[PDB]
Amino acid sequence: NPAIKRIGNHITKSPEDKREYRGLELANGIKVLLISDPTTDKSSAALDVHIGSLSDPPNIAGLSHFLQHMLFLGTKKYPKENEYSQFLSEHAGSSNAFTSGEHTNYYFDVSHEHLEGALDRFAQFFLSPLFDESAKDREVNAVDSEHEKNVMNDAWRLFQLEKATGNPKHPFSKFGTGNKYTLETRPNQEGIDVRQELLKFHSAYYSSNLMAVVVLGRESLDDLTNLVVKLFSEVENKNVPLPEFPEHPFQEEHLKQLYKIVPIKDIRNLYVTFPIPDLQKYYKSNPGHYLGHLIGHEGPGSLLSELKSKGWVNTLVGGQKEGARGFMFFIINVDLTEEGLLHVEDIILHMFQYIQKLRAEGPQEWVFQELKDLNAVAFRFKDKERPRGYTSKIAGILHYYPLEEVLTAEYLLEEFRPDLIEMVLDKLRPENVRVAIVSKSFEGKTDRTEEWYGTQYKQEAIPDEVIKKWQNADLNGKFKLPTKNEFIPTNFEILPLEKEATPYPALIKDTAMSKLWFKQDDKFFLPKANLNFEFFSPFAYVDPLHSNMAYLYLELLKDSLNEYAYAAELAGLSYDLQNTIYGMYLSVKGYNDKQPILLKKIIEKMATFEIDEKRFEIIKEAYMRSLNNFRAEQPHQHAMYYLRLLMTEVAWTKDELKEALDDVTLPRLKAFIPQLLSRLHIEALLHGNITKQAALGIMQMVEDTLIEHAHTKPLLPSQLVRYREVQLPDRGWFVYQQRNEVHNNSGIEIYYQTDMQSTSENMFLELFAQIISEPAFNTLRTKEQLGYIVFSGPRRANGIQGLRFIIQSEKPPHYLESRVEAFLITMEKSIEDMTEEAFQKHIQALAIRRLDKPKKLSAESAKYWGEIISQQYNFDRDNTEVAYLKTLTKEDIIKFYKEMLAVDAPRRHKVSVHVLAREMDSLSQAPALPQPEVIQNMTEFKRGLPLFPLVKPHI
Amino acid sequence: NNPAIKRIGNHITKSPEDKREYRGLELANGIKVLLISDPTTDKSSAALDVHIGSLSDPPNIAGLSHFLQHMLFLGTKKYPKENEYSQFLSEHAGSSNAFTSGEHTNYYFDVSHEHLEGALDRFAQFFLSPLFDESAKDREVNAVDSEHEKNVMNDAWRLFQLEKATGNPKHPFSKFGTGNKYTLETRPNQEGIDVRQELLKFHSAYYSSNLMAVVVLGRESLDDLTNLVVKLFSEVENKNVPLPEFPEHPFQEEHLKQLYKIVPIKDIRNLYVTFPIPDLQKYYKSNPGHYLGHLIGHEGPGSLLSELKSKGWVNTLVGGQKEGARGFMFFIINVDLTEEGLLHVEDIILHMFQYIQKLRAEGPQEWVFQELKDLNAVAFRFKDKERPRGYTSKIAGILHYYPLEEVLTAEYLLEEFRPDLIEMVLDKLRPENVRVAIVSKSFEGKTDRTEEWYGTQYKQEAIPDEVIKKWQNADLNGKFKLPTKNEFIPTNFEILPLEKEATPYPALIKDTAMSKLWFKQDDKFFLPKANLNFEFFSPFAYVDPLHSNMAYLYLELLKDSLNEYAYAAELAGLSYDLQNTIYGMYLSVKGYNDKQPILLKKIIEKMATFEIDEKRFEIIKEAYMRSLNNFRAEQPHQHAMYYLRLLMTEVAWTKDELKEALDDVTLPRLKAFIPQLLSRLHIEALLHGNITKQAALGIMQMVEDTLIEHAHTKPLLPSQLVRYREVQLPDRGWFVYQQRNEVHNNSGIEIYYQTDMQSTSENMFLELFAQIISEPAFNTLRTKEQLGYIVFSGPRRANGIQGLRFIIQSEKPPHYLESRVEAFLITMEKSIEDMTEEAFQKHIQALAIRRLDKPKKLSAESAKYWGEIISQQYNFDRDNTEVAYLKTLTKEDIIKFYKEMLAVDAPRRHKVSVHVLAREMDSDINLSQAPALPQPEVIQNMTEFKRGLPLFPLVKPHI
Numbered sequence A: 001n002p003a004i005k006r007i008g009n010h011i012t013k014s015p016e017d018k019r020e021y022r023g024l025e026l027a028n029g030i031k032v033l034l035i036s037d038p039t040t041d042k043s044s045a046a047l048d049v050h051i052g053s054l055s056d057p058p059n060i061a062g063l064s065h066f067l068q069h070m071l072f073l074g075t076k077k078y079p080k081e082n083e084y085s086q087f088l089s090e091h092a093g094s095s096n097a098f099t100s101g102e103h104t105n106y107y108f109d110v111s112h113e114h115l116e117g118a119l120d121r122f123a124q125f126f127l128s129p130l131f132d133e134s135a136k137d138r139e140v141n142a143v144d145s146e147h148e149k150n151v152m153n154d155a156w157r158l159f160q161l162e163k164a165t166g167n168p169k170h171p172f173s174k175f176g177t178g179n180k181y182t183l184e185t186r187p188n189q190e191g192i193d194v195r196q197e198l199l200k201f202h203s204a205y206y207s208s209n210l211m212a213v214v215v216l217g218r219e220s221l222d223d224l225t226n227l228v229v230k231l232f233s234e235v236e237n238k239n240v241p242l243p244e245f246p247e248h249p250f251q252e253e254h255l256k257q258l259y260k261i262v263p264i265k266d267i268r269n270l271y272v273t274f275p276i277p278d279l280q281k282y283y284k285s286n287p288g289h290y291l292g293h294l295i296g297h298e299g300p301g302s303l304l305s306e307l308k309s310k311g312w313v314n315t316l317v318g319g320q321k322e323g324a325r326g327f328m329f330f331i332i333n334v335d336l337t338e339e340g341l342l343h344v345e346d347i348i349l350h351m352f353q354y355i356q357k358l359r360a361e362g363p364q365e366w367v368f369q370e371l372k373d374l375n376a377v378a379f380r381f382k383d384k385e386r387p388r389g390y391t392s393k394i395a396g397i398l399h400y401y402p403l404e405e406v407l408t409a410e411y412l413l414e415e416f417r418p419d420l421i422e423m424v425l426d427k428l429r430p431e432n433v434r435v436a437i438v439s440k441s442f443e444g445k446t447d448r449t450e451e452w453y454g455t456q457y458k459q460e461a462i463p464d465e466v467i468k469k470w471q472n473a474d475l476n477g478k479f480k481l482p483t484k485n486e487f488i489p490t491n492f493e494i495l496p497l498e499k500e501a502t503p504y505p506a507l508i509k510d511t512a513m514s515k516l517w518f519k520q521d522d523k524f525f526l527p528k529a530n531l532n533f534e535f536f537s538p539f540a541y542v543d544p545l546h547s548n549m550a551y552l553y554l555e556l557l558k559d560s561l562n563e564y565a566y567a568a569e570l571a572g573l574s575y576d577l578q579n580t581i582y583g584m585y586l587s588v589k590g591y592n593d594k595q596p597i598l599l600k601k602i603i604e605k606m607a608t609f610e611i612d613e614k615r616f617e618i619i620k621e622a623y624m625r626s627l628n629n630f631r632a633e634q635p636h637q638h639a640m641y642y643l644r645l646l647m648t649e650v651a652w653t654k655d656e657l658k659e660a661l662d663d664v665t666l667p668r669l670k671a672f673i674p675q676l677l678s679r680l681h682i683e684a685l686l687h688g689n690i691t692k693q694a695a696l697g698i699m700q701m702v703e704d705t706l707i708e709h710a711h712t713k714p715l716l717p718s719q720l721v722r723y724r725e726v727q728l729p730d731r732g733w734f735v736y737q738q739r740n741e742v743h744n745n746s747g748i749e750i751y752y753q754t755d756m757q758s759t760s761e762n763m764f765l766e767l768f769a770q771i772i773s774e775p776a777f778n779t780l781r782t783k784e785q786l787g788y789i790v791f792s793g794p795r796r797a798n799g800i801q802g803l804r805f806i807i808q809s810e811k812p813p814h815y816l817e818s819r820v821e822a823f824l825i826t827m828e829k830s831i832e833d834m835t836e837e838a839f840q841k842h843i844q845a846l847a848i849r850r851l852d853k854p855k856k857l858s859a860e861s862a863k864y865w866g867e868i869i870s871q872q873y874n875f876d877r878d879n880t881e882v883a884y885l886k887t888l889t890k891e892d893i894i895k896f897y898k899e900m901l902a903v904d905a906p907r908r909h910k911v912s913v914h915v916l917a918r919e920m921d922s923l924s925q926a927p928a929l930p931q932p933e934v935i936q937n938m939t940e941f942k943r944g945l946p947l948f949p950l951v952k953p954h955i
Numbered sequence B: 001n002n003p004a005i006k007r008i009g010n011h012i013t014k015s016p017e018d019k020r021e022y023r024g025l026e027l028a029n030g031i032k033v034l035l036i037s038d039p040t041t042d043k044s045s046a047a048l049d050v051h052i053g054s055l056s057d058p059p060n061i062a063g064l065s066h067f068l069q070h071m072l073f074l075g076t077k078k079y080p081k082e083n084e085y086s087q088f089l090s091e092h093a094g095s096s097n098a099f100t101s102g103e104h105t106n107y108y109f110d111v112s113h114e115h116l117e118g119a120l121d122r123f124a125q126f127f128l129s130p131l132f133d134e135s136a137k138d139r140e141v142n143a144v145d146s147e148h149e150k151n152v153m154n155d156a157w158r159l160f161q162l163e164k165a166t167g168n169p170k171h172p173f174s175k176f177g178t179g180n181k182y183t184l185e186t187r188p189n190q191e192g193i194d195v196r197q198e199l200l201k202f203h204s205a206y207y208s209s210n211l212m213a214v215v216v217l218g219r220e221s222l223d224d225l226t227n228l229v230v231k232l233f234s235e236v237e238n239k240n241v242p243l244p245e246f247p248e249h250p251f252q253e254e255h256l257k258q259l260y261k262i263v264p265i266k267d268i269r270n271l272y273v274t275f276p277i278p279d280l281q282k283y284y285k286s287n288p289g290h291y292l293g294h295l296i297g298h299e300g301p302g303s304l305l306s307e308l309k310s311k312g313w314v315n316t317l318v319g320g321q322k323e324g325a326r327g328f329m330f331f332i333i334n335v336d337l338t339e340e341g342l343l344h345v346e347d348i349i350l351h352m353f354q355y356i357q358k359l360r361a362e363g364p365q366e367w368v369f370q371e372l373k374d375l376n377a378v379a380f381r382f383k384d385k386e387r388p389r390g391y392t393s394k395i396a397g398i399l400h401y402y403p404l405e406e407v408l409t410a411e412y413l414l415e416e417f418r419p420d421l422i423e424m425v426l427d428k429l430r431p432e433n434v435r436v437a438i439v440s441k442s443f444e445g446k447t448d449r450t451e452e453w454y455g456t457q458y459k460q461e462a463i464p465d466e467v468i469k470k471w472q473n474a475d476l477n478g479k480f481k482l483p484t485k486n487e488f489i490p491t492n493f494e495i496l497p498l499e500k501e502a503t504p505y506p507a508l509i510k511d512t513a514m515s516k517l518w519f520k521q522d523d524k525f526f527l528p529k530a531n532l533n534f535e536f537f538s539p540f541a542y543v544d545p546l547h548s549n550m551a552y553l554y555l556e557l558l559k560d561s562l563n564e565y566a567y568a569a570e571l572a573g574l575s576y577d578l579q580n581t582i583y584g585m586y587l588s589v590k591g592y593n594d595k596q597p598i599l600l601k602k603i604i605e606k607m608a609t610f611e612i613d614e615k616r617f618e619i620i621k622e623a624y625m626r627s628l629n630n631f632r633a634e635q636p637h638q639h640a641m642y643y644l645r646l647l648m649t650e651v652a653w654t655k656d657e658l659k660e661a662l663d664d665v666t667l668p669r670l671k672a673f674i675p676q677l678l679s680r681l682h683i684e685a686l687l688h689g690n691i692t693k694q695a696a697l698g699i700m701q702m703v704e705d706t707l708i709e710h711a712h713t714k715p716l717l718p719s720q721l722v723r724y725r726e727v728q729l730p731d732r733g734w735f736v737y738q739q740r741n742e743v744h745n746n747s748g749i750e751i752y753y754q755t756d757m758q759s760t761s762e763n764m765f766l767e768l769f770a771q772i773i774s775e776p777a778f779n780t781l782r783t784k785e786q787l788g789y790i791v792f793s794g795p796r797r798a799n800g801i802q803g804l805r806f807i808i809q810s811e812k813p814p815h816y817l818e819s820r821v822e823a824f825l826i827t828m829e830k831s832i833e834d835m836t837e838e839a840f841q842k843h844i845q846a847l848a849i850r851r852l853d854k855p856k857k858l859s860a861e862s863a864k865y866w867g868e869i870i871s872q873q874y875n876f877d878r879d880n881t882e883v884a885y886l887k888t889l890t891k892e893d894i895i896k897f898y899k900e901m902l903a904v905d906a907p908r909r910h911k912v913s914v915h916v917l918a919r920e921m922d923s924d925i926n927l928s929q930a931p932a933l934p935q936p937e938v939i940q941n942m943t944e945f946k947r948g949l950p951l952f953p954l955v956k957p958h959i
């Protein structure tokens, strides 16, 4: 009651938003946002502490992150560490947390009926945490797992490297994650009791005055107010001043510097950075957004367009980048072609020529107005967010914007401040640059090493003569400001729900050329539509060469349409175009208004587009590198890849694709395109703000454009062949072994093939998967410490299914095999032993997950598209399958496990892929395992086995 | 010495390569004999040819000679049983058949070499004391009616009889030789005619020893064979019947300068040009008709065909002499017609006369005669060993026309060049003596006559005198030239010594990404020949219907372009075959090894550097369209077999999908297809014959190098070498696919009981069951029940899978044939339970002998090896291994197998039936009881059927 310092005024929201909001500040300094949503299926809450890794002690790197893991381990009210995670698990809930440089964000979701119980357990960690000593070692191992994961990742390596080259005394040089060495090895050597320093950091930093709470529930604003005051007013206020970092981590000696970096993957990238003051305070005018929009533009006359025309770069990212409170960066990042790598100096001069063109032309009010207008449309028609992510996001935002501006924060622009644009543009000068080149061409030509990741690099000062050349850049006529964006939507009319509107997609067209599935949106009522097209051709995957040609065609087509499509993308109209094992896939999403205009341009271009020889050669080289770069992918990813090659009727390997790539000539590709488009079948899903007639009109326009320009004729029904899954023999065990040449970790996929999909088979497998899910994580990951990646669940491909296990470990694959088999026995035991009440809780947990309602149109369309791409067309699956699930007995699951999964099962169909670590050589009692049949040749393996039938559709 | 022998002939001229021994003699009763002693023979044979046929038929019974042929072999005084001869042959791995022509009735059998005396004794009784069992009368009439009814839907039998009906009706050549129900039952009953008494009248008047010729082939010596033939044939009654002669041509002045316009069954366009000629038989040592047929029928450069093709009128031509009877013959020039050719019949004929006049102007050529004589000498010397049954039948006929000493050289050796005789024959090839027939559907409803024996519709017109005058005054055409020296005539007949490392079966001598090469140097026949088989694999040959059409057109255009050049090689005993498959292309080169690499090189070069002539492309495309439509006029059982292959194979394009995609085949599309097809290949080859390992490797390298150079061929990935799988039928399932034949008023059916994947055991279970049921299936379904003209049973093998099949063509509905087959299977289940171990072991022994039967020519050996290669099983020693397993089999093992896989109540019964309805069809009696049959699942959509079933694995290779 007097526990409230102030209640905010109206929380500005979209007129389309039916959720109710209340902003307030508690007497202890906690900033609060309450969200009342009577329709919500899940309730949520988040707390964001404005303290992170930048506040870590110099002697303990990763302490803030360690505290994040340690904070949620029992309280005075709820002593058991498992209490919070167990309560959420029992009430269809989840939780997670993240530590950044200036924040530690904690969040959960729970069933709408259990918000008070979940929130009470959550609030206790900010009142009386116990920090349970029992879990210390495991958490250190969980922080060490997260770091060891990122070590071989090129992006994280680059992230730490930038921190290592600036002012060494600056908190920005800190290693924020931590690992075993920083949280255990070094403090033990140095005589640091980690527990007392953790407790000390918590006492010094965890103050209510630096905390922000967001709560979303079914309950009214008043009921939510009372509950938050009840649970959060007791949080201790220590009046901790908010840490600021006003000195830029890059001083005069850190400027006009050049870095030459060796990557893990075969990538060529150029990173251009300028230190800038913190622009956060200027958010109402956002001059960095204005400059990022122009420098990062991809339309005609853009910086990117000229760099592409010159054959130096393929992609560009430009704009402002966060630092911390007090410092920021302005970046211009490009990828490089082979020629671009030899013209780094010319690329930079071109970047400065474009910057100087912005100075010469001066700020543009019309550009600012367009950005403001698009942001207003984006805010008004924003998709409804999933509660968990929505509370977490707002909890962070509460620290930067007044209560009333919490939702409009990242959207609304108000005043045009040309002076501020000019101020920022004055910093984008050669005397203020930092340049980094990432290339394998630097291997063995570097003298320095970054300590955290092992990144090899060289530092050089940029010559004064190079700086002078950049300063004296002659004006380039190729650079022009963008023109008026003609894709800005204006028609937001929501068409009335038709008399014959359906709850699921209906087949409205069934011809030799096309199958058309349509549903007018009856849930979201936003002026948007999703238009999905699957184009089928036997010539898209007939051999590796054709598969390569299908890929290059679509990449060149997207490259050619880029300048035009970018304006549409800025205006909330996006598309995706990709090749498949059956043909092509096209998706058009966003505002329905200019949607037929973009679709028409894509179909026309598909059928009559010009191939630029220079682009062809550049895209072909990039595709070759992309294929090789798969060697640097994670061992578990490799395991999953080999199993797909093994189990599918036709599948071309990365090696067969790269070998056939050299035979792709420009004349061969020019003949391929009319061949591919000559005969097609189109299957579509048109879902959103559209009528039945408008849907038919869109499909007809796609057909007519292809018929006109490509002389498209339909395929015969006998030509519409889908690939089958390999039928494994009863009691058989096959193993396929390979080695990852990059990572020193093992990868494994174990697949227990069951049978063809059916209502019963799906539910037996899904309920077994539900039951084993939590124990698999608790046993294999938590207890046994097998590895970071421990996964179990149903595997579905080509109408067939089974149980799979995916594990990435430092331990050999043969050992992971015995541990999984050991676990299956423990699970057989666990089902025999479990109470009917515990069993019925598994049925209910599964039923809730299956009936989980899409919060946005794309999530609904994706569910319908899944039914279409599998040719099962079971749109009412969730209801029918849940109804069957509820009839299932504990005995039914025991019977199923005994026939299909048990080590001694008569119908056990086991296939394992073993991916060895780089250096690798070629507890519950584990059962006796048979000798596996080692697969030497994938072709002979497939030839020697039958192929399953394909699933009968739902008519 | 022996009084029963009138005379013994001198040396029977044979090839120096022929190890068989021959003896010619004439018996005292007038029987001309040839005895063949072959100690090597697996089967013994004998034939008797009576120099009396259909031309001697009485006007009261048309088909009486033919009816006698069927009635003679039904009971004897020594062997009273009606089926005694048939049973004896069936029990001793034998067979028999007979034919009646205009001037001959030829009877023949084959039997296991150990049972010649027993088979021959039963055979000889029919010429000593025949009975003609009154009980088999109606069943023989129905057999003759079946034969004719079958010929009724055949366009060639229609033409043959229409030719007989447009000559002098008073001439015996106009007679209907076959007979039918009407001439054998309907008519004699209405007229009070005694068919049996007229049958005996004819036999007693014509069947005389003085008009008979006997040939006997066996392992026995010439002396043992002499005694046996004298013993069995000297008692044949001599009635001194004079040999009928027909010296007046059935084509008299009023039958000349006549034009016929005929309606065919299939959509075919043909032109037939006929000239009456005197009987040239007596001139066999010079054979002027052969000389003239060789030039008029020539396909090389400057030929009549070449010009007719260039003009776009015809695709193919047949020219030469045609048999008539003793006293008359015909000279023919037959062509097929394009759409334009049909409108230029008058111009085609003028061109035929221009070529004929060019032969008159140039006069006979001694060098042409010498080439024909030289090729015939090579052909006679290196001839493959003939099957005994066909060899005895042929000689029995030949004995009536040539002296005993010339019976083998008869149809081979030319001696004297008689330019006067060539000139004499060429004088008859004139417009005033011409008969012209046009066959086209364009005449449908525009005809006024009907040939009553066949129902053929036609129109007759006299050719205008003005048209005859134009043909007589034909201006000389320079496009017509005589052929040049045939450079393909083989000269090198060296048999290369058998290499130290020569193998009994083909060995893999090359295993690369581009080619698998199987090689075997011949170690059996020692003739200067070799068979070169190439299978070219490409995923682009059958990817879709359009590509399948393009693969077909490419190869047809390629054979058309290479025709002029290949014809000279074909004349010189060097032939080739080039055809598209569901996996790519198939090329086979056979004959004399000498100029073999030269022809192969030209084919590969042409394949890779092919320039398509637009005019040919359009002509060949139209002919392919008609060929696809023409399948509707194919027999109902052929349709049934076709639908089952479509149903059971993973990928298969229908005739309808092929014809629909044909209109999209443009010239630029075909020109892009060829480099695409040849860009990536895998070659699998079998080179077998008179060749060494090095020569084999040199041939393969030359094929590879030619493709690599001209087509830039690269190998296919091993994962791209995919073979099609067979559909895996569910346990206890029965599927039926039903269609209708719009042309024939007969039903067609194929029943397939799918068993399992091929293996040593599975193959032998199925093969032994097939062995046991074979003869009973024919005797029950065909002979007793009278189901149809076509009754077949045996193992069905496709894509590594197998089963039992039944193929039947009947006038009865397919669901009735179904019940009868199922009743038969029960009778067979019974028969195996009942049979003695001795009878069972006789089945094992009969199968083992058939499986171990040695190939008798190189092509038969290569075909066996090629079967192992095309199936990718490579089990060249299969026969020995499989026979060894077969001998271990028990009667119980077969009962178990039948009970699990084939029985109506079997737990693993996989039945699939194709039912092809007749044109006008709509869908106790002391007979075997048909079981209760389930309701079949009717296949409506072939695609849905395949999608809903699993696919079998592919068979693991031996090598």
Ligand SMILES: C[Se]CC[C@H](N)C(=O)N[C@H](C(=O)Nc1ccc(C)cc1)C1CCCCC1
Pocket: A289, A290, A292, A293, A294, A295, A296, A297, A298, A316, A317, A318, A319, A320, A321, A322, A331
């Ligand atoms: C997803 Se890639 C699109 C590449 C496009 N060429 C580009 O540069 N776009 C700008 C952009 O995302 N820049 C950005 C984002 C994050 C950071 C850390 C820094 C810069 C925007 C232009 C519209 C106004 C806002 C920015």
Ligand SMILES: C[Se]CC[C@H](N)C(=O)N[C@H](C(=O)Nc1ccc(C)cc1)C1CCCCC1
Pocket: B290, B291, B293, B294, B296, B297, B298, B299, B317, B318, B319, B320, B321, B322, B323, B332
């Ligand atoms: C088999 Se298709 C080859 C068609 C070739 N264009 C051609 O006419 N060749 C002549 C031929 O078969 N004519 C023939 C055969 C049978 C009868 C009843 C009538 C004529 C022969 C040429 C060598 C000398 C002997 C004949």
Ligand SMILES: [Zn+2]
Pocket: A065, A069, A142, A143, A146
């Ligand atoms: Zn963490």
Ligand SMILES: [Zn+2]
Pocket: B066, B069, B070, B144, B147
């Ligand atoms: Zn007959």
